[PDB]
Amino acid sequence: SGFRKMAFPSGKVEGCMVQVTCGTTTLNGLWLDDVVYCPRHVICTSEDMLNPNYEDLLIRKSNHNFLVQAGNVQLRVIGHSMQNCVLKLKVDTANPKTPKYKFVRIQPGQTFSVLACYNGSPSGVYQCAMRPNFTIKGSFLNGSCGSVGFNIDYDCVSFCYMHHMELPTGVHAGTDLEGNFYGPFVDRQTAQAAGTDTTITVNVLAWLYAAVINGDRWFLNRFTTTLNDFNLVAMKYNYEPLTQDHVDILGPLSAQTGIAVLDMCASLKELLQNGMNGRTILGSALLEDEFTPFDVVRQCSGVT
Amino acid sequence: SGFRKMAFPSGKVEGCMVQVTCGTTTLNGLWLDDVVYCPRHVICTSEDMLNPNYEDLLIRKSNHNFLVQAGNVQLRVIGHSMQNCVLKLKVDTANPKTPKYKFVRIQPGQTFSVLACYNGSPSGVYQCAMRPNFTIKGSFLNGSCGSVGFNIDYDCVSFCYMHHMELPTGVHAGTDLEGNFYGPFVDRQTAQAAGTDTTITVNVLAWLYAAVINGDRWFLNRFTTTLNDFNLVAMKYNYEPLTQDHVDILGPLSAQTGIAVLDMCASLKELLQNGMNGRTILGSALLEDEFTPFDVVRQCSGVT
Ligand SMILES: Cc1ccncc1NC(=O)Cc1cncc(Cl)c1
Numbered sequence: 001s002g003f004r005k006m007a008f009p010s011g012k013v014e015g016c017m018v019q020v021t022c023g024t025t026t027l028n029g030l031w032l033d034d035v036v037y038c039p040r041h042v043i044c045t046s047e048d049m050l051n052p053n054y055e056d057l058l059i060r061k062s063n064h065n066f067l068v069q070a071g072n073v074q075l076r077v078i079g080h081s082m083q084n085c086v087l088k089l090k091v092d093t094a095n096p097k098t099p100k101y102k103f104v105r106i107q108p109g110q111t112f113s114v115l116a117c118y119n120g121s122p123s124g125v126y127q128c129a130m131r132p133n134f135t136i137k138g139s140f141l142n143g144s145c146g147s148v149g150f151n152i153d154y155d156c157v158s159f160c161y162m163h164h165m166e167l168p169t170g171v172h173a174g175t176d177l178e179g180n181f182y183g184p185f186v187d188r189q190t191a192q193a194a195g196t197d198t199t200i201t202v203n204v205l206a207w208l209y210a211a212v213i214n215g216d217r218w219f220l221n222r223f224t225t226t227l228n229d230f231n232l233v234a235m236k237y238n239y240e241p242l243t244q245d246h247v248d249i250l251g252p253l254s255a256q257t258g259i260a261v262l263d264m265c266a267s268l269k270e271l272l273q274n275g276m277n278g279r280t281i282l283g284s285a286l287l288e289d290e291f292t293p294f295d296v297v298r299q300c301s302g303v304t
Numbered sequence: 305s306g307f308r309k310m311a312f313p314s315g316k317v318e319g320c321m322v323q324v325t326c327g328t329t330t331l332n333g334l335w336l337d338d339v340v341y342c343p344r345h346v347i348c349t350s351e352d353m354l355n356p357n358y359e360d361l362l363i364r365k366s367n368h369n370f371l372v373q374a375g376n377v378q379l380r381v382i383g384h385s386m387q388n389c390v391l392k393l394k395v396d397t398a399n400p401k402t403p404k405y406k407f408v409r410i411q412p413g414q415t416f417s418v419l420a421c422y423n424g425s426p427s428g429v430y431q432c433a434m435r436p437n438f439t440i441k442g443s444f445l446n447g448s449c450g451s452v453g454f455n456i457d458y459d460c461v462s463f464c465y466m467h468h469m470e471l472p473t474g475v476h477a478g479t480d481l482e483g484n485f486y487g488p489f490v491d492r493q494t495a496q497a498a499g500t501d502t503t504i505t506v507n508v509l510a511w512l513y514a515a516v517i518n519g520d521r522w523f524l525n526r527f528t529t530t531l532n533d534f535n536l537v538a539m540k541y542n543y544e545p546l547t548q549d550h551v552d553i554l555g556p557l558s559a560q561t562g563i564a565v566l567d568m569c570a571s572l573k574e575l576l577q578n579g580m581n582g583r584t585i586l587g588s589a590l591l592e593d594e595f596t597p598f599d600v601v602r603q604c605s606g607v608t
């Protein structure tokens with residue numbers, strides 16, 4: 001029992017973290033096989049960031065200008081290319097610590113662990129969710145760029161995120177490992193406002209099932225609702241509309257607890273309309289939306 | 305910016321996790337140098353747990369009865385001894401992945417990361433605090449015993465906790481790495497109620513400073529208080545009494561923000577008396593007490 005915002009064990013990612021320096025800018029890189037992945041803004045100076053022409057900037061850069069350091073050993077850069085907003089630095093040595101890996105572009109609402117790094121060194125790990133507005137509410141400071149988001153399935157690390165930017169609102173924007181930003185963000189020091197941050201309804205329901213499994217049941221009511229009735233409430237409270245796909249993925253939680261998905265929706269409806277009335281659910285005084293139904297199942301069963 | 309419940313990167317601990325089987329009981333072990341540390345209840349059967357005589361049970365156990373598996377390779381057990389509530393299994397091979405380490409007995413209020421494991425395999429990592437009543441509000445299921453709590457200072461892992469037990473209230477009790485339980489708990493399947501879980505006042509203040517640093521300032525008021533006046537409020541709200549030692553450790557946060565510790569105490573006093581009035585602080589609708597002043601400094605500066 002107990003329910004925690006659990007991150008994946010970061011070991012497999014730690015062995016991939018390197019430091020990339022280009023000129024006077026130092027950020028993190030991800031070394032997998034003989035390639036180092038890093039945000040292309042490593043080639044920029046603070047002045048360049050206002051309106052960078054990355055292709056023009058990359059012309060003035062040679063393989064020797066990219067300093068890649070793994071722990072304390074230097075990697076020899078034998079190739080460089082730009083793929084969208086990431087630089088792929090071909091090095092002469094395959095990372096001996098490269099885990100089994102995939103590059104995945106996650107959907108909004110999906111969660112992942114972040115291994116926050118500075119100068120190629122890991123400082124901490126935390127669980128995040130790709131917000132519906134394609135930002136992540138992370139914890140990053142200057143130098144954290146290049147830190148990656150990932151998920152792990154047994155021995156395979158699915159890298160899904162690379163941190164690039166902090167928006168003026170303190171929220172974070174980044175790319176998948178092909179260098180494509182999540183959301184409409186560009187890697188430019190320009191004000192880019194994020195869209196409405198809606199609540200990930202399916203995740204809140206998944207977390208409500210986790211609460212029932214772990215003992216917190218006060219919020220269960222004598223009511224039920226329909227997907228349409230629930231969505232009227234979800235729209236008013238800036239919750240993502242619930243679909244039959246969401247109901248389907250909540251099926252294993254509904255089966256374990258014996259609480260129909262629409263019955264749980266009615267509990268969520270009442271929680272939205274009446275608040276928590278000073279009470280808590282899994283030690284939280286608000287509705288947690290950064291646990292997917294898969295995370296709840298995984299944590300509640302002990303998947304390693 | 306952004307503030308997260310960050311755990312230490314778990315890599316150094318992952319390379320120490322092994323599976324220990326004694327008879328039909330399998331739990332986690334911590335392999336450092338040529339020793340494997342695990343809860344002594346690994347020698348128990350479910351019947352034995354009701355009233356175990358560990359010395360009598362250990363007599364019937366030989367080195368060959370302890371099966372220690374690291375990943376998929378078997379460790380040869382050349383010695384066994386019981387130190388308080390832990391078993392130290394001397395193996396013939398030093399763990400090649402043993403990081404620099406220390407065994408530390410933490411104080412209540414101090415935080416640590418937990419690498420939850422099942423059958424010697426890590427499932428996740430999360431940040432915890434040793435509650436003032438010496439329990440931890442973790443996330444553990446059957447088979448998680450032997451999972452360890454730790455802190456990391458650059459390259460040195462300070463192991464502070466080993467999970468042993470789940471109390472009937474769903475909270476967790478365990479030992480330091482010398483096998484001494486935190487709190488009055490015994491490794492017996494008997495109802496052991498925990499004491500009052502008070503709030504770690506110094507940590508809530510540290511988290512309030514983290515909120516100010518990151519932009520959440522709505523709770524700052526035009527008031528101040530004294531340690532004695534604050535403690536009258538802290539006692540009523542089952543908060544730990546604040547001492548001058550606590551004020552001293554909040555000094556670097558007070559200096560960075562320019563908000564005197566007693567002024568922050570007055571904001572906390574008002575938050576206790578009036579609640580949050582539907583608002584949030586660092587995305588939380590309650591006062592977070594599982595970030596020490598050291599954690600706030602570390603996260604807010606980027607210590608790797
Ligand atoms: C200072 C900081 C804090 C947290 N996370 C990231 C950063 N860094 C930046 O945002 C720098 C930057 C500026 N303009 C466009 C890009 Cl691509 C990157």
Ligand SMILES: Cc1ccncc1NC(=O)Cc1cncc(Cl)c1
Nearest residue numbers: 345444445446468469470491492493
């Ligand atoms: C089932 C579970 C869930 C989470 N954490 C731990 C456990 N296991 C136990 O508590 C088993 C146990 C019983 N009596 C005394 C001891 Cl030392 C250990």
